[PDB]
Amino acid sequence: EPALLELEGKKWRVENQENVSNLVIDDTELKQVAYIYKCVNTTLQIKGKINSITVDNCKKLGLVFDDVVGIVEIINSRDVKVQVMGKVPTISINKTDGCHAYLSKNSLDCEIVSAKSSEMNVLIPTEGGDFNEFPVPEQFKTLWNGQKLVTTVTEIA
Amino acid sequence: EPALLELEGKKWRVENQENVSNLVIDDTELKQVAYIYKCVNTTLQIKGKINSITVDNCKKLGLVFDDVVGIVEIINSRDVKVQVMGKVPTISINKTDGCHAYLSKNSLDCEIVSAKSSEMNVLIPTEGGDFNEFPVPEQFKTLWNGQKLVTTVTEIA
Amino acid sequence: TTALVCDNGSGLVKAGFAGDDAPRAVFPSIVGRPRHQGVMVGMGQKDSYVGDEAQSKRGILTLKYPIEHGIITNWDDMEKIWHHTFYNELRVAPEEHPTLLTEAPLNPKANREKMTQIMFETFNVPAMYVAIQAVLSLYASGRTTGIVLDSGDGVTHNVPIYEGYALPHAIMRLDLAGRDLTDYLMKILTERGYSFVTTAEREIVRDIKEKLCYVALDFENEMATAASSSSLEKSYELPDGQVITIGNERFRCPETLFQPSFIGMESAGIHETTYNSIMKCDIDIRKDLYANNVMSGGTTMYPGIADRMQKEITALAPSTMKIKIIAPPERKYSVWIGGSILASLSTFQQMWITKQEYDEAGPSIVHRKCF
Amino acid sequence: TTALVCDNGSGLVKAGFAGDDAPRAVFPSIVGRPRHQGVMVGMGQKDSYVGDEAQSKRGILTLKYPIEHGIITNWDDMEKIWHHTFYNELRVAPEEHPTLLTEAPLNPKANREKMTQIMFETFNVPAMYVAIQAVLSLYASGRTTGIVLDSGDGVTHNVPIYEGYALPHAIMRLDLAGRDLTDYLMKILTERGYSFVTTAEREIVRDIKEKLCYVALDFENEMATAASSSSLEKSYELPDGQVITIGNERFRCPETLFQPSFIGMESAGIHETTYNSIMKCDIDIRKDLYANNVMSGGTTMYPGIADRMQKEITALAPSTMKIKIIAPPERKYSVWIGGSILASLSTFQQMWITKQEYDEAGPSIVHRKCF
Ligand SMILES: Nc1ncnc2c1ncn2[C@@H]1O[C@H](COP(=O)(O)OP(=O)(O)O)[C@@H](O)[C@H]1O
Ligand SMILES: Nc1ncnc2c1ncn2[C@@H]1O[C@H](COP(=O)(O)OP(=O)(O)O)[C@@H](O)[C@H]1O
Ligand SMILES: [Mg+2]
Ligand SMILES: [Mg+2]
């Protein structure tokens, strides 16, 4: 119903966007943050280094960014494509279903945090004109050892 | 709106129960399974050894059972208390919020499987008239090692 | 109303009509995509190729294997495998046929929910159903209780089942199957001076394996029989018309199933994994699992496999115990055969999840209706 | 309209009114329950005791520590801590006061959502807010950028913050804090022949620690000064009126913070964890974090702690680098002080999440409104 993209204080208000493939945040400063909310079937690109990014309640979203200081957080969303062109220390995928983290040749140390999520794939680029896909686990096994709970990752390899 | 507890074929149809503390499944056979659905604020007790138990879309549910051959599966529920008096090989907690697995002095080898869940606690009994509580992790850390994704459990200890 | 059965395999998709003696369509569960590396966000998704077409264009395309380990990890890729199954392989309208889907063991609750979603929302199906693979294989042998050894293309599972309900703590995954044996056969054929390297040459190795490879009753007895005489040696004709003579490779290739140390695997053998699984199960069910061992999928088609299984299980289990390995000749398609018989039954039309039901409950309805 | 600030600590809950110079209520975040062992399913939940009352009745009650490690693991227990905070400690009606809650670092999205749910649904609050602990401590020093070293009762965190947004990859958890130092002080006081064992005797050890324990600038220089003369030795009066003389225990107890090997911990010291955390951060922010080190919580109240921190960080960081450790005397309640100043600001009434807003979006509104 409503629709806006604007810098409110220090944060980018990318809200209620519905079917827009050419969406670019060109002017940027380390200080600034981004909050993408209620975007359905839209593609967005943040150019430059910024503090942090959050994606809340987005359906079929696609985000490309250059560099991040803090974290990129994908929350209560579905079918989200996220990509680094530069560096990103952490990618958090929380209560989201279908999330494709396309990393960059620098973001290879990127920590992918997951919680209440599914269909998560970490895309690692090769020198072959493509990316190799790798699924993120989503089921876990806790045991009573006699002194403490021991939780192990239910592998897909 | 509707309300029934009955043996349909081989499965117990404990469906649409709303505020009943004294609910017991007395007659039981290894062969039989239990499917507790849409129960709000009710307490149920299965007496004897049965094949399996499932809890689907239950709010503030409390289940006590004796022995299980297969698995106890808690699905799309909230605020669920589950207890073994005997033996249970696996307890699966899937898309549920608030789940308290009270184990038994035999069910100490019980594997607690978790997926898209939160507020999970494994209750281990002591010879002191109570149980010691232990939380189940719910946030995870995946890394690119250079050849494969490495996922580690974000501890609460 | 003609219902479809779709077995979503780690290596091959098996599809057809419920009631038919075998799957009408059998193709590689591979999706091939053009190579891209820039801004990787989809505006309006271009061209894609599925199956044998993808696999052949291996060099020039990035190939996606979404069912690689039994569990579907990518839904856009899966939708492409399904859309190719419907319109191109089976040449039918999904909107007119109720559809049954096979599911891997230890499949996430979210995974079964998404299967339902895609079926109803992305293919407009009148009804659908999710059944577990090992269960359908057991159901084919008429049994509802037994330990199924399912050896497919990319994964091997041991699945104990009591009264049509799998015992998940005792399910054993062994990431050693068909593609691994074909690979090893290629590795050990280099020894005799034969060089199979092209995607096209692999097809010949797969052919050799399927035709000449047998499981030895006693490996060392056979390795000495192969060393003393050329009695066990056999000839194979290549496409060009040349004849190659293969020796001990015949039994050394499916011996990796029992001895994984042959490919550098720390994993225990298929006989060990079976025993271990029955041991994990309750003492009250062990007898039934011992007497009802059901073999399923392509990588169980080897001659002598069942005889060896008997011999190795008799060895680990107590002296008193009765062991019966069951290897139906249909075992290569027994999952599909099971689902075919199931969707066929007149006392199953109640069992389907209809779009009227989905319109109300959503994908969560799979847990209740597919129990 | 008088707004409440509630800091949910791992050891102590700090509550009061936004605007007040310090928390009105400071009690143990312990819930005590009667001992039960049968059918453990709640019909209509009986009696419970919170805080000092729980802690004193330690022997006869099963005590629950829901915030034990910073993150709330039990909501029925948390509702009891909150209901005791409102009606019994602060003696106010939650329905009349907008409420601010402090949150641990690396807190789950579900955890913040449930905080919102309980506040609105279980306490009927007019509005509420979720703010991160380390952030509120930084906000107290007027700063929005810095590395906060928060040492509380049960957990120690290093939290780098850039423009009021925490850098989660660089957050460092050290499960060594206040309760550990008190425990070690008890262990090393047994040496001098003093025996503190009762829950009541622990209170004396906590008192000694808080009063006589200092952080040595150079541990070995002090261990030799303590060995040569009784210059560093000090006297302490016990409740009964006896006087005990404590020596080297004074500096050996908070030296565990820097040398965890003293309690058998493989963990690196608080100086190491700080450096390591700044190193994990981007090269473009490291200078600001070096110059803006903010100390917070009870276990930072030790004398000499900041001087040592300067000395150890100067040692690891490059020779050129400027380091400024900031230890405000208010640091024991700086999280609460921060939230107090925040809920007070007239340019914050916009920031609250109202029940009218909650009635629409539900608990998911916390991510948007508390960003
Ligand atoms: N006659 C045969 N003998 C031995 N192996 C076979 C035979 N037929 C098929 N296979 C092998 O088994 C695999 C196919 O098994 P299948 O059960 O369809 O796998 P999935 O369901 O995992 O896709 C292939 O690797 C194939 O080469
Ligand atoms: N003056 C003091 N000197 C040293 N330690 C102190 C002092 N005051 C409090 N502490 C200790 O610090 C802890 C309380 O710290 P606090 O920040 O309130 O913890 P939390 O927020 O984790 O509940 C207790 O273990 C207490 O003994
Ligand atoms: Mg299969
Ligand atoms: Mg604190």
Q: In this structure, are residues C246 and C285 in contact, taking their beta carbons and an 8 Å threshold?
A: no
* Tokens coding D196: 């503190």
C293-296 and C146-151 strand pairing: parallel
CA distance linking residue B144 with residue D370, whole number of Å: 31
Breakpoints of chain D, after residues (C–N > 2.5 Å): none
| Pairwise CB contact (< 8 Å): B136 & A149 | yes
Backbone phi, psi, residue D73, to 5°: -105, -10
Find all residues with CB under 8 Å of D241, minimum gap 6, and list them.
none
Rounded to whole angstroms, the Cα distance separating C48 from C50 reads: 7
CA distance C19 to D196: 80
Residue C319 Cα to ligand 3 middle (Å):
33
Structure tokens at D65: 């520590």
Q: Are D213 and D247 in contact (CB under 8 A)?
A: no
Task: Tell me the sheet residues that pair with C36.
Answer: none
Crossing angle, helix C133-140 and helix C334-344, to 10 degrees?
80
- Our CA-based measurement puts residue B88 at a distance from the nearest CA of chain C, in whole angstroms, of 10
Q: Which helix (H) or strand (E) holds C199?
A: helix C199-212
The answer to whether the CB of B58 falls within 8 A of the CB of B40 is: yes
| Interchain proximity B10–C285, CB inside 8 Å | no
Q: What token pair was written down for C58?
A: 């291996």
Phi, psi of A5 (to 5 degrees): -135, 115
Q: What Cα–Cα distance (Å) separates residue D348 from each residue in B131, D99, D342, D343, D359?
A: 44, 12, 7, 6, 21
Q: Which atom of ligand 2 is nearest to the CA of D301?
A: 3
| Amino acid occupying residue C268 | A
- Count Cα neighbours of A77 within 13 Å in the Cβ-side half-sphere: 31
Contact indicator for D8, D73 with CB cutoff of 8 Å: no
Neighbours of D162 (CB within 10 A): 23
Question: C178-189 and C199-212 helices cross at what angle (nearest 10)?
Answer: 100
Beta-carbon separation of A76 and D367 below 8 A:
yes
CA dist D22 and C351 (Å) reads 64
Query: What are the distances in angstroms from CA D294 to CA D47, D70, D291?
Result: 42, 19, 10
Q: Closest by alpha carbon to D86, among D119, D114, D127, D55?
A: D119
DSSP letter (8 states) at residue A10? T
Position D8: which residue type? N
For tokens 């850098």, the residue is D167
Radius of gyration for the alpha carbons in chain A, expressed in angstroms and rounded: 17
Reported in sequence order, the residue ranges of A27-87 that DSSP labels E, i.e. its strands, are 33-37, 43-50, 52-56, 62-68, 71-75, 78-84
Q: Which of B124, B139, B143 sits opposite A115 (nearest CB)?
A: B139
Decide whether any atom of ligand 1 lies within 6 Å of the C179 Cβ.
yes
Write the residues followed by a gap in chain A (C–N more than 2.5 A): none
Pocket test for ligand 1, best of C10, C12, C213, C253 (most atoms within 8 A of CB): C12
Q: How far is CA C347 from CA A110, C199, C342, in A?
A: 53, 46, 9
How distant is the Cα of B21 from the closest Cα of chain C, in angstroms? 24
Can you give the residue ranges of every domain in chain C?
Answer: 2-30+67-130+333-369, 31-64, 132-177+267-328, 178-263
Contact partners, residue D113, CB within 8 Å, separation at least 6: D363, D364, D366, D367
- Measure the CA–CA gap between C113 and C92, rounded to whole angstroms: 24
Domain that holds residue B129: 1-157
Radius of gyration for the alpha carbons in chain B, expressed in angstroms and rounded = 17
* Residue C314 to residue A151: CA distance in whole angstroms: 35
User: Which numeric CATH code is attached to C2-30+67-130+333-369?
Assistant: 3.30.420.40
Please work out, in degrees rounded to the nearest 5, the angle formed at the alpha carbon of residue C320 by the alpha carbons of C317 and C326.
60
User: Is residue A52 within 8 Å of residue A71, measured between CB atoms?
Assistant: yes
Please answer yes or no on whether B54 and C371 come within 8 Å at the CB atom. yes
| CATH code, domain with A110 | 2.160.20.70
Closest CA to C162 of B89, B6, A155: B89
- CA A52-A75-A131 angle, to 5 degrees, is 75
Angle separating helix axes C270-280 and C305-316, nearest 10 degrees:
50
Measure the CA–CA gap between D30 and C124, rounded to whole angstroms: 55
Rg, C-alpha atoms of chain C: 22
- Comparing C2-30+67-130+333-369 with C132-177+267-328, is the CATH topology the same? yes
How many Cα atoms within 13 Å fall on the side-chain side of residue C108?
A: 25
In whole angstroms, give the CA distance from residue B10 to residue C248. Answer: 52
Cβ-Cβ contacts under 8 Å, B117 against chain A: 116
Neighbours of A155 (CB within 10 A): 14
Q: Is C257 helix (H, G, I), strand (E, B) or coil?
A: coil
CA of D22 to the centre of ligand 3 (A): 65
Identify whether the C-beta of residue C39 lies closer than 8 Å to the C-beta of residue C31.
Answer: no
Q: Which one of A12, A75, A91 would you mutate to disrupt binding with D, by most D Cβ within 10 Å of its Cβ?
A: A75
Closest partner CB to C163 (pick from B31, B54, B87): B31
DSSP annotation string for C122-186: IT--SEEEEEEHHHHHHHHTT-SSEEEEEE-SS-EEEEEEETTEE-GGG-EEES--HHHHHHHHH
Sign of CA dihedral C125, C129, C134, C137: negative
The closest alpha carbon to D340, from D152, D131, D84, belongs to D131
Cβ pair A92:D168 closer than 8 A: yes
Label residues C133-171 b or e (16+ Cβ within 10 Å = b): bbbbbbbbbebebbbbbbbbbbbbbbbbbbbbbbbbbbb
- Contact assessment for residue D8 and residue D15, using Cβ atoms and an 8 Å cutoff: no
Please give, rounded to a whole number of angstroms, the shortest distance from the CA of B5 to a CA of chain D.
Answer: 19
Label residue C338 left, alpha or beta by phi (over 0 means left) and psi (-120 to 50 means alpha).
Answer: alpha
Please tell me the distance from the alpha carbon of residue A4 to that of residue A39, in angstroms, as a whole number: 10
D82: left (phi over 0), alpha (psi -120 to 50) or beta: alpha
Residue A27: CA count within 13 A, CB half-sphere: 6
D132-177+267-328 carries CATH number 3.30.420.40: yes
Q: Residue D362's closest CA among D98, D123, D120, D128? A: D120
Q: Is the CB of C206 under 6 A from ligand 1?
A: yes
What is the spatial distance between Cα C139 and Cα D118, in angstroms, rounded to a whole number?
Answer: 48
**Nearest Cα residue to C150 out of C330, C286, C298, C259:** C298
Q: Residue D117 and residue B119: Cα distance in Å, rounded?
A: 14
Domain count, chain A: 1
- Provide the resolution (angstroms): 2.8
- What is chain A's percent helix, strand, coil content, to nearest 5? 0, 60, 40
Contact present, A74 and A95 (Cβ < 8 Å): no
Candidates B21, B121, B139; nearest CB to D73? B121
Q: Kindly report the CATH number that applies to the domain delimited by C31-64.
A: 2.30.36.70
Q: CATH number for the C178-263 domain, one of 3.40.50.300, 3.40.190.10, 3.90.640.10, 3.30.2420.10?
A: 3.90.640.10
Map chain D to HEC letters: CCCEEEEECCCEEEEEECCCCCCCEEEECCEEEECCCCCCCCCCCCCCEECHHHHHCCCCEEEECCCCCCCCCCHHHHHHHHHHHHHHHHCCCHHHCCEEEEECCCCCHHHHHHHHHHHHHHCCCCEEEEEEHHHHHHHHCCCCCEEEEEECCCCEEEEEEECCEECHHHCEEECCCHHHHHHHHHHHHCCCCCCCCCHHHHHHHHHHHHHHCCCCCCHHHHHHHHHHCCCCCEEEECCCCCEEEECCHHHHCHHHCCCHHHCCCCCCCHHHHHHHHHHHCCCCCHHHHHHCEEEECHHHCCCCHHHHHHHHHHHHCCCCCCCCEECCHHHHCHHHHHHHHHHHCHHHCCCCEEHHHHHHHHHHHHHHHCC
**Number of C-alpha atoms within 13 angstroms, CB side, residue D159?**
29
Helices D178-189 and D199-212, axial angle in degrees (round to 10): 100
| CB C106, CB A154: distance < 8 Å | yes
Which 3 state secondary structure label does DSSP give A117? coil
Coil, strand or helix at B46 = strand
